[PDB]
Amino acid sequence: IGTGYDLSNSVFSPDGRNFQVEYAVKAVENGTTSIGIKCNDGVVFAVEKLITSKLLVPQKNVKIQVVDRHIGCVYSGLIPDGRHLVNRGREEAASFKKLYKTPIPIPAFADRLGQYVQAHTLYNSVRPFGVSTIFGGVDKNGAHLYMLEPSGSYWGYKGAATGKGRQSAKAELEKLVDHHPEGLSAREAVKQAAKIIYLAHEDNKEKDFELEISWCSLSETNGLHKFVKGDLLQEAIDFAQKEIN
Amino acid sequence: TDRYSFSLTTFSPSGKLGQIDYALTAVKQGVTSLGIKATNGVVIATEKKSSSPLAMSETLSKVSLLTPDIGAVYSGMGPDYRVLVDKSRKVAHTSYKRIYGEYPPTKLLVSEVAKIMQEATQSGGVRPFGVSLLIAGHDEFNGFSLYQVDPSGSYFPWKATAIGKGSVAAKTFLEKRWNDELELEDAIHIALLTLKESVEGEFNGDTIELAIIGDENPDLLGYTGIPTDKGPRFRKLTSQEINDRLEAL
Amino acid sequence: SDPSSINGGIVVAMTGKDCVAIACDLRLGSQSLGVSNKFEKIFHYGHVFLGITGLATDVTTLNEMFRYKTNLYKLKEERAIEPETFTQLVSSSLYERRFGPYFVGPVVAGINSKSGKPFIAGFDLIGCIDEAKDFIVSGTASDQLFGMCESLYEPNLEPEDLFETISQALLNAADRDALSGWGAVVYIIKKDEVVKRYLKMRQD
Amino acid sequence: GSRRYDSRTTIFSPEGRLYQVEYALESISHAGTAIGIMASDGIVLAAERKVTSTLLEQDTSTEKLYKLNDKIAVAVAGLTADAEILINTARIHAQNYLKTYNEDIPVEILVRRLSDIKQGYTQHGGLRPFGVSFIYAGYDDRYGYQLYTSNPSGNYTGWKAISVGANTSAAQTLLQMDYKDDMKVDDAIELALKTLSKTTDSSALTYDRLEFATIRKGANDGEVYQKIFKPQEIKDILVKTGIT
Amino acid sequence: NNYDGDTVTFSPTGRLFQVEYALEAIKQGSVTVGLRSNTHAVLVALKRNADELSSYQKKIIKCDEHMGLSLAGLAPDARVLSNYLRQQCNYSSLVFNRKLAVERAGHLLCDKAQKNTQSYGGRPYGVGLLIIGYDKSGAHLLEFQPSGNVTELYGTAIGARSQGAKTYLERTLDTFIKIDGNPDELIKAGVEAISQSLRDESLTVDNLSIAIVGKDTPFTIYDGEAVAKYI
Amino acid sequence: EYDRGVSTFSPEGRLFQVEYSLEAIKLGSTAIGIATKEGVVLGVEKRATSPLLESDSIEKIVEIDRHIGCAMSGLTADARSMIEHARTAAVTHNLYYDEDINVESLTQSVCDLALRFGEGASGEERLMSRPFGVALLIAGHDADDGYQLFHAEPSGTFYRYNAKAIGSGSEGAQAELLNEWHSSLTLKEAELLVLKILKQVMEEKLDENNAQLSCITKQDGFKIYDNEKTAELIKELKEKEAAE
Amino acid sequence: YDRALSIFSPDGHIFQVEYALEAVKRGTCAVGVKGKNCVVLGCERRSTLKLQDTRITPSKVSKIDSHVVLSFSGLNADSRILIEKARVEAQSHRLTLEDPVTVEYLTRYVAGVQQRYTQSGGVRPFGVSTLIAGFDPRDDEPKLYQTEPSGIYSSWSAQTIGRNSKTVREFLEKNYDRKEPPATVEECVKLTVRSLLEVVQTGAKNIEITVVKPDSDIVALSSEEINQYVTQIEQEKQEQQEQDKKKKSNH
Amino acid sequence: GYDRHITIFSPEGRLYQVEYAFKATNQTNINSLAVRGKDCTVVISQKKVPDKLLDPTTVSYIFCISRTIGMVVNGPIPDARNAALRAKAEAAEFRYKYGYDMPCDVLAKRMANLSQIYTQRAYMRPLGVILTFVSVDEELGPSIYKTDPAGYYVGYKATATGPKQQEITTNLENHFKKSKIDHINEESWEKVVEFAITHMIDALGTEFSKNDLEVGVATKDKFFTLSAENIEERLVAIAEQ
């Protein structure tokens, strides 16, 4: 009965579902595809970054921003809103680092951002988030990887994806843990992070793209989040071209 | 955050506030409860109910002590009773006890709990409380005294009264059994007996909670050696005690 | 100098059997100069009597403060406040202004209507309830009062033995003190009947 | 949004008229009668309770006579819950005026102050008005006895005899008809019970539905004593005027 | 339905409609074309007056001695942002002795626009700015959306009939980057570009406003007789 | 369309409340303004609604400071809040740098106040709930650009006009201006030029008890003309149209 | 609370201003007529309500200063709040800037009170229209002003607000000369009484006349004065009728 | 008009909105069964892992609050992390100001109030989660207190939750009706976990693996969860049954 249940978000529809928050998932679907392979060594992020026209500048724009010095945060959905969730954890981590004098754990960080994205679903004065982030890194508790839904829900993962090509990415990571049962180093895992983005560009084969790959690994960068670049990258690209032919 | 600063208790077009009436509706769904004011005590009785028989009702309080002389009993919402018992305790101590050194008279505490009702009709973003309380008590100046606080925010002194789902039957039975003089043993004998024509589940001392604000006890005071202080006049009766008196109906 | 000796003032209070009496001087000075020989330091809310010593202005401030609080007590609970209940309110009002306090020293004197007992109590600056069933003295001739009062007084007095004792106690400290005296009023408080008797005494 | 859910209680209608104010006066007609009659020696205040029962204590209920201060009482018509908030604000406001000027508050001043609080909520903040209407019986040295009614809108107008609450129309017209200026309190008592006998919503005018109070100049030492009568003195005076 | 007058509510098609409507504020504004190289960036703006007696509306706003913003949306909304950019430019100089980077200045900008699109009673800014500037990374041209999304471009345009300018630039893209040390030509290639957005509006000494930034030139706005050698 | 907010849009994409404010400019009474190189004339229809009216207490020309004047048409109570800030701003600048404020800088500062509608938005306080409904013709003389005349909008955008009209008869006024304006007007031909346009868009008789002229010249600052001189000038318009 | 309750309308108004103007119509009428040495503000006092003690009751004319008086028509609950702010500003002016208020400042201030509330949320405009009259101190010319719910003011030489405003004002246009006002104080009272007896009628209880003179003389005329003047206008009226009646027969 | 969309009372005296919170505590589809031993308290829950990629370790529904008090959550996992967070913050706060470790009795009351306050302000959404708090008190013995979206709580002998909980409640009911005692008797805690698993295998109609279980036990002065290796050991002891 009644009319509505979609005008506010601190209503609950009768089924037991939400709205707006239920609708915000469709918003993340309009984004690009972005993957994370949790390696034994670390994590390797990669993101499909669309190139619309040649008017834009290549390798000069990013969807991989660092948080702290040892956490990649890479996001899909509505990009300013996704950048606000990255902004928020830069503040959060700096306070923790002031307060307790240690690099902020990944499991601590996972709790912190989670509470905030949950927090916007509890008032009608602010809008629910319409982005999903895939974040992880290397801290001293080992390598960890997380995906955080705009629902305010997050879980452990060893492979994640979100955006348009989440069907092909989810399935091709299933294949990736089932190739390798004892796992793989991050140096090899750069090459798979390229392959499954190119396979998730067949959902976006009306467009052309530039590939950004980044890593945080214990022993390839000493546990520090950097960008993959140069000669190592051009090799990941070549592997991926052959794989889709 | 907040962005509500306008009432949702509003007058209807033919008069009468819509919201204070609805709130009074939620009370008559709830349990049946009664209070009988005698010449030497006040007895109150209520019926205890649980989710399931695996739920205990011995760790749930449907009778509370506000001060050592003034107790409470409700018909209505459990949750609303919970918060409204705590805020009363806090205001009983902070808005009189510190300053005047003794616990508030029964009238005076009643008056205070009535403004809390009022600020949940008035002030933005809130809806009324959904309990009607009986607040029975004893003070030195009104003798024993019985009041009924309602969601409206008004109180009425009674001689004996009922609230709940059996309220109409209860008060017709109470009309014929209130007498000018009632002894404390007689008062208990009417209150269990009224509540028994308003029970259709189990009848045992573990399902019937009874509390007297009889006469004073120098055995629940916790000390001896100050004769000024005379202990709790409030005394909740355990399940066994109530049960002896059920076999003696 | 002293913030409670710059206009002086004294209050004496005694109990008897079935009666109390309280009494104050009528001196308001500004230091050395006498300004007035007719300022009261005793006031009455109902049948309770509250004598207030110490700095000139805080006697008056404090009178209108308790005037406010006594009205709200009586209106809600529909009786005149009892001596014992009131003493607790005299303590709390001092303590609220714990820092930079009211530079007074009141005396509560009554006879309870609910038990018929003489009841008296005292306070310092910050206010510590001083029980007694003897007498309580306060002010700037209080060192003298404590000795003088004790010496004459016999435990329990008749209503008009009590007028002769508390009158002499007050006179003799007040003419050995420089900031006290100068006309004085003694009250005899029985059950239901209070007489206010001014005293003939030394003005010089 | 939160803008959706706003009632808008503080807007003008197209007629130029305040919905919540018209409704507040409407709901005060459900609440019991209240009458005040101003003699030239006192004021009689007499009110018929809005509820009665056979189990209810009828001897400490106060829902009609309440003392704001020593020399100023009200009769209440509206909901009592609403009235209780304003009654502790008035008691304070009076008691303050005494505190700073060492003289008891004029009746004019205390009545304009109550109206201003009430006006305030219809004026600003988006909060309901309090549905209460008071008749003030009060004394001051300045004009002697004053009788006054204020309404939930927040305006006061003087009266010689007035009624608010239940059967308003019936009581006010009857009062004009019997009014003389030669009444004294004995007479003023009698007419106040007699008008209530005509407005009565029960079988007969019975003690247990009456609160009754006076402020008399026949009281000792040339000073007003406010006497709020007990129901055992109301029962006595009900035989005196001959109704029963 | 009421998804369209509430900036806090989605939208079963996964949008917000208000940012979209706000993106239409740019289409009804006037046209401007930006193009940049590695040593000089240029804004070439078409001012637009109301009637014959009215003046022409300035469309290049000086933000600093090496940073400039140009609006193409609505003017009142642009006055809130212009200060904001100035404020963070002086704070960066003041505290860190740093002539505020162009790329980082975009990232500040984002979050000012976002926080009112998250909040009710708020609105996205209807203006969309093209922001030029010369730092140590060279020249840059940013396009700022009402969305709060910033992107980095060799040359672009926004306003009315913006698509035709994007085409003139998509072709001539590989000509002007390899022009370096010759601001004269860089200014000339944008005059031809904004001429494809006209519809008999022409370019005069009262219509054309150019502003440039260099490695050897500060911020300068040319107007009046200074753009009359570049018609 | 959507007026269930003040920072609501519009598939058009413009402020909806601002759009509504521009149409409350056409219910004012016409203010005309001619800017030349000898000074600026600001003339206004004051309007006479009654001949009980005292018409000279109705002013639509007001001095902000010695070298800046303003003309308002629309809701003149809104112009009270905005003219107040102008007065404060201009004076503030003369304390802080001890110099003339530009006509431009002055105009610009006043656009910022109008845009402060809202329920709470931006890094600043919105302290209105609905926008102003008044348009300004800020005239003046600054020592940079000489004589300048600006039109300050309730939008928050300002354009410098050689000549502009605002008001009911705005639309028809401005048509005459496109042909009759040129830069070879003398000062006293500008005064007659105002009354020529004012007589045409007049909804009454043209006279001096519902018209007011004012100038800004360097030589005597801002001076608002007497009603005697306005009469002479109304009749000298009338002589040159009968030399036809 | 900050919600907009004043929202610009697509009619080119605010609905809350037009509606408040309507609130004012329902009031009981005040008439303002100014002499050459007096102002006279008279107001309608209802005579439906009866056993209304008026010794203690607030007058429909309230003195703000000892020489500037205000009367009001429209909502009578709202009226006292404006009076309260206006009284306080008058005594602030005396305090900090010195000298008693001008009529012009006080009016201009009252205009600013309603104006402020016109563009603030969380409120609604007052529905009270004011006639403020009195003399400026160190001058002896009558000043008569009207403020309205918008927050705009205009001066007048006679004015009326409230109920049946059109009928009176229409009369005042035709029985007054703006070049030469009423010669003396008496003539000025007789013209205000003649206007009230049009719409109001119903006895002489309704008529109240306040006369303010320069040099801070506020006097309010008691019932006996009113009555002398009411009788002269009723007879004069009767007498005319009779002499018209003779003239008709003659023709 | 609107009353099913905010938190004001309906004509019937009921809060429809509060009623939807009880139909939103079942969306997880996870069943839990909690029983009181002699000196131990046991809670067993289902744990599902939907995919390959997800790691079960992190997937949890047993959150440690105090150091003696755990909390097992049915209903959505956002309202679970927020409810865990507040409850945890309070637990610390109590230690700080009264200088002992929090009684469960009081955290059940404490959270009941905060739950309620979210049905008592219109903006604030109430939390759609049923929290079951397991402890061993040092004054109040082994206890279970269960809160629910109204801001009600009551104690339990034993309790069950989830959507299929009707089946489970009855099995539990029989055991104590038959016995006539309010708690399971046995001193070794290992076996109270055993009893519990059987009662769940019969009620839900299924056998289990170690990954389908996640088992938490509160002994005296400590709360722990058993590892998945150790849980296999509990499963062998059912063949010895």
Side-chain angles (χ1 to χ4, degrees), chain C residues 60-61 64-65 67-72 74-76 78, chain D residues 67-70 88 91-92 95-96 98-100 102 228:
Chain C
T60 317
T61 314
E64 64 177 86
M65 199 282 181
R67 177 151 54 144
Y68 191 97
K69 289 283 182 298
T70 64
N71 297 333
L72 296 156
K74 291 185 199 297
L75 278 165
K76 280 165 170 64
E78 285 288 287
Chain D
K67 283 195 295 183
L68 306 172
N69 62 87
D70 45 296
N88 281 3
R91 276 160 169 165
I92 275 169
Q95 285 179 33
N96 192 76
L98 176 66
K99 193 184 149 56
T100 60
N102 300 39
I228 303 190

Side-chain angles (χ1 to χ4, degrees), chain A residues 149-189:
Chain A
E149 307 201 299
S151 191
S153 306
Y154 75 96
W155 307 106
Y157 287 89
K158 297 169 65 177
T162 187
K164 284 187 188 299
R166 64 170 74 194
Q167 292 180 55
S168 199
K170 272 278 194 324
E172 287 296 303
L173 290 156
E174 291 182 59
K175 302 180 181 188
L176 196 44
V177 191
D178 200 85
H179 304 320
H180 288 305
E182 25 60 74
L184 73 149
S185 306
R187 170 61 190 271
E188 183 51 65

Side-chain angles (χ1 to χ4, degrees), chain G residues 7-231:
Chain G
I7 316 183
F8 222 86
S9 304
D11 293 63
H13 292 276
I14 303 166
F15 298 135
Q16 310 304 316
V17 169
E18 281 194 309
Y19 303 163
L21 294 173
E22 203 66 46
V24 171
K25 182 69 64 177
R26 313 195 176 281
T28 42
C29 200
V31 183
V33 185
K34 87 189 190 194
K36 303 186 190 282
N37 57 344
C38 53
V39 306
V40 186
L41 297 179
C43 202
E44 175 181 11
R45 167 165 291 276
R46 301 188 189 91
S47 62
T48 303
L49 290 162
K50 298 175 180 58
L51 297 186
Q52 181 163 291
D53 185 285
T54 40
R55 308 190 287 86
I56 75 188
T57 303
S59 297
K60 302 294 177 293
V61 176
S62 277
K63 61 208 289 175
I64 306 306
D65 292 285
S66 295
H67 62 295
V68 178
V69 300
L70 180 145
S71 185
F72 51 92
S73 295
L75 296 179
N76 307 287
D78 278 271
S79 94
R80 299 174 298 111
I81 308 289
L82 292 162
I83 287 169
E84 204 178 58
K85 305 196 177 189
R87 287 162 52 72
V88 171
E89 186 53 75
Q91 295 282 162
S92 302
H93 185 250
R94 294 186 180 184
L95 197 69
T96 51
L97 273 148
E98 308 191 303
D99 298 304
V101 289
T102 53
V103 198
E104 185 167 89
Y105 185 51
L106 195 66
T107 300
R108 170 173 288 124
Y109 176 75
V110 166
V113 189
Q114 317 196 73
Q115 189 262 116
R116 174 75 299 134
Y117 271 63
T118 321
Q119 59 185 268
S120 180
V123 293
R124 50 131 181 94
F126 305 81
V128 183
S129 171
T130 58
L131 287 183
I132 305 172
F135 293 82
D136 300 283
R138 303 169 303 183
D139 301 295
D140 51 52
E141 303 74 72
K143 301 301 183 174
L144 173 72
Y145 282 114
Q146 188 256 330
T147 310
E148 51 159 340
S150 299
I152 308 163
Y153 70 102
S154 287
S155 194
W156 301 79
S157 296
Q159 187 48 358
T160 175
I161 49 160
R163 70 185 62 186
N164 301 109
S165 61
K166 189 51 192 171
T167 316
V168 180
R169 190 179 297 107
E170 163 194 82
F171 194 73
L172 286 175
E173 290 158 55
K174 292 296 155 62
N175 290 214
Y176 188 83
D177 193 45
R178 169 188 171 186
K179 295 95 191 170
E180 296 299 277
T184 58
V185 176
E186 298 281 284
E187 298 297 304
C188 205
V189 176
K190 295 167 171 48
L191 179 49
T192 303
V193 180
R194 191 180 304 166
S195 305
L196 293 156
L197 283 175
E198 287 173 290
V199 317
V200 187
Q201 309 154 97
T202 63
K205 143 169 186 170
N206 296 60
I207 302 178
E208 299 162 298
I209 294 289
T210 310
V211 180
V212 182
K213 310 185 179 67
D215 307 287
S216 315
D217 292 75
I218 303 162
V219 293
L221 309 173
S222 57
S223 188
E224 293 92 49
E225 308 310 301
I226 304 296
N227 294 322
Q228 283 187 44
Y229 299 137
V230 167
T231 58

Side-chain angles (χ1 to χ4, degrees), chain H:
Chain H
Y2 298 110
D3 35 304
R4 300 172 301 275
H5 294 279
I6 29 178
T7 53
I8 70 160
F9 282 123
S10 73
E12 187 73 67
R14 294 152 65 201
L15 298 151
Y16 293 107
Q17 205 57 60
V18 176
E19 284 174 60
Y20 303 156
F22 297 94
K23 293 184 68 72
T25 37
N26 313 126
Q27 295 307 304
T28 39
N29 302 86
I30 301 293
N31 294 291
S32 55
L33 171 166
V35 284
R36 299 166 50 202
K38 187 180 291 166
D39 60 281
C40 61
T41 298
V42 178
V43 56
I44 64 180
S45 52
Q46 303 189 104
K47 186 180 60 202
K48 299 278 159 186
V49 208
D51 311 78
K52 185 153 181 174
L53 303 183
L54 282 68
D55 164 52
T57 293
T58 312
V59 184
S60 285
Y61 284 120
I62 318 183
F63 290 94
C64 312
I65 318 291
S66 289
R67 305 165 60 66
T68 311
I69 308 171
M71 195 185 75
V72 168
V73 189
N74 308 87
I77 186 62
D79 300 311
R81 293 192 180 100
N82 186 54
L85 179 88
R86 177 64 195 251
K88 262 181 305 197
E90 299 269 78
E93 200 53 81
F94 188 88
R95 175 68 196 183
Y96 178 60
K97 300 182 167 183
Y98 295 94
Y100 64 109
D101 202 90
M102 207 173 184
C104 202
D105 203 81
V106 190
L107 169 73
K109 194 187 283 78
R110 189 70 66 74
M111 291 287 289
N113 313 327
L114 297 167
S115 281
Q116 197 261 340
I117 285 170
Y118 319 141
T119 57
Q120 209 173 179
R121 299 303 310 258
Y123 66 87
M124 180 60 157
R125 201 181 65 183
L127 299 168
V129 270
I130 285 164
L131 306 160
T132 300
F133 282 107
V134 284
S135 55
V136 170
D137 285 294
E138 322 287 305
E139 287 185 28
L140 299 161
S143 307
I144 309 190
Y145 298 96
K146 195 171 76 74
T147 47
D148 56 57
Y152 180 60
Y153 82 91
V154 63
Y156 277 102
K157 294 190 192 47
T159 192
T161 342
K164 301 173 43 55
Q165 72 95 238
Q166 185 63 60
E167 315 292 289
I168 312 172
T169 292
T170 302
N171 252 67
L172 297 160
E173 183 59 70
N174 308 128
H175 191 253
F176 307 104
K177 186 171 301 281
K178 184 165 303 86
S179 72
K180 313 200 166 48
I181 176 69
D182 72 311
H183 85 111
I184 305 185
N185 282 95
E186 184 57 51
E187 182 178 284
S188 296
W189 64 266
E190 294 85 53
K191 313 187 195 296
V192 175
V193 190
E194 297 151 31
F195 292 159
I197 293 166
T198 311
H199 300 349
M200 193 195 230
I201 274 163
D202 281 302
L204 294 176
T206 39
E207 310 188 94
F208 305 125
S209 264
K210 42 175 199 303
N211 307 123
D212 183 86
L213 286 171
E214 195 187 341
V215 184
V217 181
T219 43
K220 286 176 138 307
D221 309 292
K222 60 199 275 291
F223 191 90
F224 48 87
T225 54
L226 292 189
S227 56
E229 295 97 283
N230 202 240
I231 276 169
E232 200 52 35
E233 201 178 359
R234 309 295 76 233
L235 301 183
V236 200
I238 323 273
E240 310 303 292
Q241 284 177 13

Side-chain angles (χ1 to χ4, degrees), chain D residues 6 10 12-13 15-18 108 112 115-116 119 122-123 125-126 146-148 154 156-160, chain G residues 1 3 5 16 19-20 22-23 26 50-53 55-58 76-78 80-81 122 124-126:
Chain D
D6 180 53
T10 52
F12 291 116
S13 90
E15 276 187 291
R17 287 177 178 170
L18 285 153
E108 195 168 272
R112 181 183 169 169
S115 291
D116 302 317
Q119 204 305 302
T122 45
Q123 183 78 65
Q146 293 191 258
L147 200 60
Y148 276 127
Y156 60 96
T157 306
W159 301 103
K160 303 190 188 79
Chain G
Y1 202 49
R3 203 186 176 271
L5 284 156
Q16 310 304 316
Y19 303 163
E22 203 66 46
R26 313 195 176 281
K50 298 175 180 58
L51 297 186
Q52 181 163 291
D53 185 285
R55 308 190 287 86
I56 75 188
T57 303
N76 307 287
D78 278 271
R80 299 174 298 111
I81 308 289
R124 50 131 181 94
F126 305 81

